[PDB]
């Protein structure tokens, strides 16, 4: 009998993961309001406190403007429906500029540098309705039946 050796490749990235170490910016003085946010999905600001300083964020809804994308953290997140989320009434990480991996609803690779199309529920999808000023950073991979995309985020 003769021996054998095998080889396997690690996956690239995961939802709500900072893509690389370029210039970025994260806001942590924001608090979740009336619901919960999936990690890797866009959020929106409903009200900013005038004197207290905190900002109220919630999951994106139709006829609104996105502000940032929630990112991964092993300390400030909870495990629910087999995923990682931010619960109501707690501090949240919102990345406002830089490269990040986020969930997608599309089926084909996007063109480098074009505008980002958003879906009503806060996930990336072509031919969507919500208008954005972010760009694609040229990343298109799938982690075990979950479709991800690399997005470059500009500060509002």
């Amino acid at each position: 009998q003769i021996n054998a050796s095998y080889q396997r490749d690690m996956a690239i990235a995961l939802p709500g993961m900072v893509a690389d170490t370029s210039k970025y910016n994260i806001d942590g003085a924001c608090v979740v309001n009336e619901g919960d946010v999936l990690v890797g999905a866009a959020v929106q600001v409903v009200q900013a406190q005038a004197v207290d300083g905190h900002k109220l964020v919630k999951a994106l809804t139709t006829g609104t403007t996105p502000y940032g994308v929630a990112i991964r953290s092993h300390w400030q997140t909870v495990n629910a429906q087999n995923q990682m989320i931010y619960e109501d009434g707690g501090a949240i990480n919102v990345m406002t500029s830089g490269r990040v991996w986020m969930l997608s609803k599309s089926t084909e690779a996007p063109t480098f540098g074009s505008a980002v199309k958003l879906d009503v529920d806060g996930q990336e999808k072509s031919d969507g309705t919500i208008e954005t000023t972010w760009t694609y950073a040229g990343g298109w991979t799938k982690y075990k039946d979950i479709q991800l995309v690399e997005v470059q985020l500009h500060q509002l």
Binding site: Q1, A4, S5, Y6, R8
Partner: protein
């Protein structure tokens, strides 16, 4: 409660019948057993090797046939090429779905 034959994450292999109307096929059994062992070897990327086989008690006659133009049998050749494995018989394998379906477990 999920049985061991109905588990939805195990590997099932369809097989040609070893006995077709009292016509023994002693090479198909060896080929399929080797295929199953190699499948276990290549699905865990070398971290697990097959060690136990369970076969129906009525199929022990197929593995006792002398190979043509020699003395030692198919089972002896299989053991010589795959030393380190244990083969046994279980009566629970005579029927696996209530309608006479047989099977082998590796």
């Amino acid at each position: 409660i999920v049985s061991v034959f109905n588990h939805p994450n195990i590997t099932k292999i369809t097989s040609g019948k070893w006995i077709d109307a009292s016509t023994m096929k002693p090479e198909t059994a060896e080929a399929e057993l080797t295929q199953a062992i190699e499948t276990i070897e290549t699905i865990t990327r070398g971290q697990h090797r097959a060690t136990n086989i369970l076969i129906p008690p009525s199929m022990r006659k197929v593995l006792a046939i002398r190979m043509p133009e020699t003395t030692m049998s198919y089972l002896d050749y299989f053991k010589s090429q795959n030393s380190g494995i244990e083969i046994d018989s279980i009566a629970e394998l005579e029927d696996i779905d209530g309608a006479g379906t047989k099977g082998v477990l590796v």
